[PDB]
Design an enzyme around this catalytic site. Structure first.
Site, mmCIF file in Angstrom:
data_model
loop_
_atom_site.group_PDB
_atom_site.id
_atom_site.type_symbol
_atom_site.label_atom_id
_atom_site.label_comp_id
_atom_site.label_asym_id
_atom_site.label_seq_id
_atom_site.Cartn_x
_atom_site.Cartn_y
_atom_site.Cartn_z
ATOM 1 N N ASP A 1 0.797 -1.220 0.000
ATOM 2 C CA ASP A 1 0.000 0.000 0.000
ATOM 3 C C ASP A 1 0.828 1.268 0.000
ATOM 4 O OD1 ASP A 1 -2.617 -1.203 0.180
ATOM 5 O OD2 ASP A 1 -2.039 -1.790 2.237
ATOM 6 N N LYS B 1 2.475 2.481 -5.153
ATOM 7 C CA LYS B 1 3.372 2.407 -6.286
ATOM 8 C C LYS B 1 2.740 2.334 -7.654
ATOM 9 C CE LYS B 1 4.648 -2.584 -5.881
ATOM 10 N NZ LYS B 1 3.886 -2.968 -7.116
ATOM 11 N N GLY C 1 -1.840 -7.146 -7.233
ATOM 12 C CA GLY C 1 -2.810 -6.225 -7.783
ATOM 13 C C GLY C 1 -2.465 -4.789 -8.124
ATOM 14 N N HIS C 2 -2.597 -4.447 -9.401
ATOM 15 C CA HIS C 2 -2.367 -3.094 -9.911
ATOM 16 C C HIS C 2 -3.623 -2.674 -10.667
ATOM 17 C CE1 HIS C 2 -1.163 0.109 -12.593
ATOM 18 N NE2 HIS C 2 0.044 0.168 -12.064
ATOM 19 N N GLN D 1 4.674 -7.098 -3.344
ATOM 20 C CA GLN D 1 4.277 -6.734 -1.985
ATOM 21 C C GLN D 1 5.142 -5.656 -1.375
ATOM 22 O OE1 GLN D 1 4.536 -10.724 -2.237
ATOM 23 N NE2 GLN D 1 2.575 -11.282 -1.272
HETATM 24 N N1 LIG Z 1 -4.013 11.492 -2.642
HETATM 25 C C1 LIG Z 1 -3.066 10.776 -3.236
HETATM 26 N N2 LIG Z 1 -3.404 9.567 -3.645
HETATM 27 C C2 LIG Z 1 -2.361 8.951 -4.167
HETATM 28 C C3 LIG Z 1 -1.046 9.391 -4.301
HETATM 29 N N3 LIG Z 1 -0.255 8.421 -4.900
HETATM 30 C C4 LIG Z 1 -1.146 7.468 -5.076
HETATM 31 N N4 LIG Z 1 -2.443 7.722 -4.655
HETATM 32 C C5 LIG Z 1 -3.565 6.909 -4.534
HETATM 33 O O1 LIG Z 1 -3.663 6.058 -3.348
HETATM 34 C C6 LIG Z 1 -3.962 4.761 -3.815
HETATM 35 C C7 LIG Z 1 -2.599 4.026 -3.842
HETATM 36 O O2 LIG Z 1 -2.601 2.707 -4.395
HETATM 37 P P1 LIG Z 1 -2.079 2.388 -5.892
HETATM 38 O O3 LIG Z 1 -0.784 1.704 -5.797
HETATM 39 O O4 LIG Z 1 -2.306 3.547 -6.747
HETATM 40 O O5 LIG Z 1 -3.136 1.284 -6.406
HETATM 41 P P2 LIG Z 1 -2.830 0.115 -7.477
HETATM 42 N N5 LIG Z 1 -1.827 -0.946 -6.677
HETATM 43 O O6 LIG Z 1 -2.201 0.672 -8.686
HETATM 44 O O7 LIG Z 1 -4.236 -0.288 -7.674
HETATM 45 C C8 LIG Z 1 -4.619 5.003 -5.148
HETATM 46 O O8 LIG Z 1 -5.907 5.670 -5.088
HETATM 47 C C9 LIG Z 1 -3.709 5.995 -5.735
HETATM 48 O O9 LIG Z 1 -4.387 6.605 -6.834
HETATM 49 C C10 LIG Z 1 -0.686 10.690 -3.852
HETATM 50 O O10 LIG Z 1 0.432 11.213 -3.837
HETATM 51 N N6 LIG Z 1 -1.810 11.339 -3.347
#
Ligand SMILES: Nc1nc2c(ncn2[C@@H]2O[C@H](COP(=O)(O)OP(N)(=O)O)[C@@H](O)[C@H]2O)c(=O)[nH]1
Lengths: 431, 431
Positions: B13, B16, B40-41, B224
């Site tokens: 979490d 990335k 999961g991505h 992970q």
């Molecule tokens: N507010 C905010 N959300 C972020 C930031 N970087 C990532 N997110 C969000 O927090 C969550 C992070 O998980 P992420 O790795 O993106 O999900 P995945 N593994 O690609 O589904 C997602 O909603 C992502 O869009 C950031 O700097 N700010």
């Protein structure tokens, strides 16, 4: 560089023993990172007369600290025997050896399983596998095994041990028809040694980080040959763990970027113990010649080592997998007296195609035919030579050809069991 | 650096998803090196919101080859689904993906064996149930499991399967008292597609080597988080496979010395899903604010998402483990408005000593007191900034306190969810 890895580049029995003792003379730290009580090291190069299978030979030198990384499966019984053995010879083992809390413990039921598998499968055919090394690795990945750290909380250890023993006893008696191992006995044998093992536990990751940035010389040591790598060797003719240099990180806790030099031990010819593909195998008196002049009898009790020419194609795979910096050439003199010498430069596949790369496990290891390169031999002895100039022209051409075919240098040449009967062309530590 | 390895430096979490997609624009190859179908991505595609857990994100990119390395446990069932999902959305997956023949296969019995393993020792509690990744590795380790490579001989495959299915069926029926998986149901399901998979196969270590000499840009993608590492994590609270950079070599066949740069993604604050030590967990209103503001309500993957301040002490360890090169500060926008920010720098052990290193992954975590470094905050909005000047002056101090505390620089800064909300201060590929 400062952090060096030493390992066999073939299928085992390359002659790393001496090199290791020699290079352990300059190291502060000596680290084991894979395998188990199957290292095999007869002490002669300064070492009295004994075979250590678990503790590193660095345990003889008063200036070094021997470390057993988490990648090593630890049998409390094998260790205690080796300690008391050295302690009897006045060596202060307990103050020169350190262990990781993450080392899995090998226990009675682990050996008990192996002995049954060697029975259940096939039949009595020199069952040399009852060790418990593979089964300890299975419990670990399956997440039901025990580690040294578990010995810190004795209450929960009994609890954990009971749960895993119940499971092993089930298959032992209801599946294998073997004897059940006794829980109380194992708890008792383990409890009595717990205070000792934990007194040696150290944060191995942090310690090496300190040595690295402080700049100390750390020697990392592999125990099984590269091509027996569970992941990239000849499946299923492979061990239960990773044997290549890639295993240093996970087996010790250091970062992959902190691997400076990677020395690969290469014997001048080939040998394999047991089953598995071996294109260069010789079924004639040459194979014989090499077997007798090389003392390739390393397989007691009605067994033997398969012999053969050097296979530059297989070796090339080792370079790839280990990102080798240099080679250390051993047993070159075994060849003294050969009219001609051969080197496998390519594999010919069934359709006539020639390839310089090893067959994808699932391929023609069975159909491959060796493309040999034949070159002049030598009559003069090489045994004991201490300078390149003592080497005949033919042996020098052999050596350089290996370098050309392989693309990596031979920075060390061993011509005999004596420390000085070595040619260090570059030196892994100071270069 | 040409060889870029990307990964989370905590417990998953870390955010990335966006970074990997971004680096993917310049990658020629994107490689999966460990874990299985739990990587999961999530990502938007054709208005539809699908999630991929096995196939790399680079499958959309026109000129990128996605490779599943041997370190990954493969589930054909879970492969056809994703494929079918994207090939429907109009993407030529069969032509953009490749995979190792050494990949262990995950079949029905593996899941059967997984399920039973949890609902057993854990009716209303904990266990292992689920995907069947671990039973899949245990087989690789015991040397029973099958590999993509086995698929080439549809008959040798049949007999191999019958044998393993018998060994495992015995377990489920007698030991477990669960249903015995049908050998033919499995046989039929694996043959229905044998030839699709055998056609995406390639020698992956030879390929990556070719790429490394022609200087192509290869990205390695972890699944992970570092602290969940089977060996170097918060044991016993860990996962199945290794999560550190140590596994890029073992899991893909690439040499250790070829890892150029290791980007460690790191969340601006901490979260943990499920049981496990968490020395910086908050139990006040700040903890609820981070949870809420960062939309951590089990949003990405969380049945219980605890939160806390940044654990520099645990982050220091993640550096050692992966030999990190640079961080990627993520979600700093989630801290806007805080009157004050904290970063953990040391741990106070229940014995009264204060320490700056991750206590042994087996000591007294639940009793550790974290020494907090207090720092002034910012009222301004950091969410959306695109240059490191439109950023407050307190935010930069935080950024610097981290750098000095870990000894590693931050080279990228995600200030929001949209790709353009990024400040690439150094870029791993040119580095
Ligand atoms: N507010 C905010 N959300 C972020 C930031 N970087 C990532 N997110 C969000 O927090 C969550 C992070 O998980 P992420 O790795 O993106 O999900 P995945 N593994 O690609 O589904 C997602 O909603 C992502 O869009 C950031 O700097 N700010």
């Amino acid at each position: 560089g400062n952090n060096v890895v030493v390992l066999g580049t073939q299928w085992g029995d390359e002659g790393k023993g001496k090199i290791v003792d020699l290079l352990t003379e300059r190291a502060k730290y000596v680290v084991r990172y894979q395998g188990g009580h199957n290292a095999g090291h007869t002490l002669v190069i300064n070492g009295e007369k004994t075979v250590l299978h678990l503790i590193p030979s660095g345990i003889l030198r008063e200036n070094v600290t021997s470390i057993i990384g988490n990648g090593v499966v630890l049998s409390p019984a094998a260790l205690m025997k080796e300690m008391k053995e050295l302690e009897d010879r006045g060596i202060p083992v307990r103050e020169r050896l350190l262990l990781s809390e993450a080392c899995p413990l090998i226990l009675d039921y682990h050996v008990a399983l192996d002995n049954a598998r060697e029975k259940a499968r096939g039949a009595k055919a020199i069952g040399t596998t009852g060790r418990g090394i593979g089964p300890a690795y299975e419990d670990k990945v399956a997440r039901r095994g025990l580690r040294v750290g578990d010995l810190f909380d004795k209450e929960t250890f009994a609890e954990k041990l009971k749960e895993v023993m119940e499971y092993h006893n089930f298959q032992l008696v209801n599946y294998y028809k073997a004897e059940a191992v006794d829980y109380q006995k194992v708890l008792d044998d383990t409890m009595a040694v717990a205070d000792i093992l934990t007194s040696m536990v150290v944060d191995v990751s942090d310690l090496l980080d300190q040595a690295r940035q402080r700049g100390d010389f750390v020697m990392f040591e592999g125990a099984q040959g590269t091509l027996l790598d569970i992941d990239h060797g000849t499946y299923p003719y492979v061990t239960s763990s990773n044997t290549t240099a890639g295993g240093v990180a996970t087996g010790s806790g250091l970062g992959p970027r902190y691997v400076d030099y990677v020395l690969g031990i290469l014997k001048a010819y080939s040998t394999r113990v047991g089953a598995g593909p071996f294109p260069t195998e010789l079924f004639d008196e040459t194979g014989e010649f090499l077997c007798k002049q090389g003392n390739e009898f390393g397989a007691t009790t009605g067994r033997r080592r398969r012999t053969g020419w050097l296979d530059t194609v297989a070796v090339r795979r080792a370079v790839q997998l280990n990102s080798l910096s240099g080679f250390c050439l051993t047993k070159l003199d075994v060849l003294d007296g050969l009219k001609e010498v051969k080197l496998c430069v390519a594999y010919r596949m069934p359709d006539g195609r020639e390839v310089t790369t090893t067959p994808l496990a699932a391929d023609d290891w069975k159909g491959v035919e060796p493309i040999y390169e034949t070159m002049p031999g030598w009559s003069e002895s090489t045994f004991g030579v201490k300078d390149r100039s003592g080497l005949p022209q033919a042996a020098l051409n052999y050596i350089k050809r290996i370098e050309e075919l392989t693309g990596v240098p031979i920075d060390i040449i061993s011509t005999g069991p004596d420390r000085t009967e070595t040619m260090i062309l570059r030196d892994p530590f100071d270069a």
